[PDB]
């Protein structure tokens, strides 16, 4: 209620930047699969991009979306350059972590947690 903006009048002007960011990531992924010798396909990389976008698709405050664009631009800086490594890039895929069950009964069989 009558708060200040950051880089955004409201949500459409921010979704503009969001789509620009998706654009940069989609153009950047094949270069990172090549530079650092990743052992994946360009398809699943872009799928991970769209997934990590959809993880924040439930939000409406423009300031949150702007800060998320900022964080994504930082990650894109680190990934365009090779400051980070195959380790940090493959850290998104969760290639070792066993899948956390989403069923009641398996949780009941292992653990007291919901």
């Amino acid at each position: 209620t009558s708060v200040k903006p950051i880089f955004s009048r409201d949500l459409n002007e921010a979704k503009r930047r969001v789509r620009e960011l998706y654009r940069a990531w989609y153009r950047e992924v094949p270069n990172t699969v090549h530079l650092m010798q990743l052992d994946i396909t360009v398809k699943q990389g872009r799928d991970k991009v769209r997934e990590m976008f959809m993880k924040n698709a439930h939000v409406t405050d423009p300031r949150v979306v702007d800060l998320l664009v900022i964080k994504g631009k930082m990650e894109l800086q680190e990934t365009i350059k090779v400051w980070k490594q195959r380790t940090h890039v493959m850290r998104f895929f969760h290639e070792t972590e066993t899948p956390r069950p989403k069923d009641f009964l398996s949780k009941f069989y292992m653990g007291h947690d919901p």
């Binding site: 405050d61 949150v64 900022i70 930082m74 990650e75 680190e78 380790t87 940090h88 290639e95 070792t96």
Partner: protein, 207 residues
């Protein structure tokens, strides 16, 4: 004469209170709550719209040549809605005195950057962002410094756990250094130590 306790001055207290009146009456649009501690230290508190004018003033005025930035910090206080109490520690080198400038922030109420005033503040602002999440306008780089590259979180907030949310170890299956969820062989034994007896009645928060 009391050897165990610290000796107190008068002239420094009077000097810094007078200079607080000076800054207050000369920069009223931005100033709040000027104060001088028991130990001789001045402390000015500022509306975030006043960061650049106040810092440029204290850097470039003749009676206030605060042209060396010592620190730029932040203090997470979840009680107050504007959590982060951002601080600037400055010295003069012409009058041999220090001053403190303070302003507030939130996760979604950033502050103007200061590199146009002190170039020292580049990495300090990057650190405040890395640690607390306070975005800074018109900053050149503004990326992390201290944390890992693929790091999710702002550690020095009070709402972040000390042991973190992820943990590392090398797996032979993938031949990498994978990040795994935190799982300790020994839980950190938190201790409750605050005695239930008022030691300092001067700071007695009344009801």
């Amino acid at each position: 004469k009391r050897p165990t306790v610290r000796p107190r001055s008068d002239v420094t207290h009077k000097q810094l209170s007078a200079f607080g009146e000076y800054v207050a009456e000369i920069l009223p649009k931005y100033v709040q709550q000027v104060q001088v501690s028991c130990l001789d230290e001045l402390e000015i508190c500022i509306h975030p719209d006043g960061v650049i004018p106040t810092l440029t003033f204290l850097r470039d005025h003749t009676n206030a040549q605060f042209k060396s930035l010592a620190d730029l910090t932040a203090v997470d206080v979840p009680t107050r809605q504007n959590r982060f109490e951002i601080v600037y520690n400055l010295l003069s080198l012409r009058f041999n005195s220090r001053i403190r400038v303070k302003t507030y922030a939130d996760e979604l109420t950033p502050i103007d950057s200061i590199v146009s005033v002190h170039i020292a503040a580049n990495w300090y602002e990057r650190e405040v962002w890395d640690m607390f999440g306070v975005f800074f306008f018109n900053h050149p780089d503004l990326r992390r410094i201290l944390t890992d590259y693929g790091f999710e979180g702002h550690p020095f907030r009070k709402d972040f756990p000390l042991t973190g949310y992820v943990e590392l170890r090398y797996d032979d299956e993938v031949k990498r250094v994978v990040a795994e969820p935190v799982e300790l062989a020994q839980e950190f034994r938190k201790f409750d130590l605050n005695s239930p007896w008022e030691a300092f009645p001067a700071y007695r928060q009344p009801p």
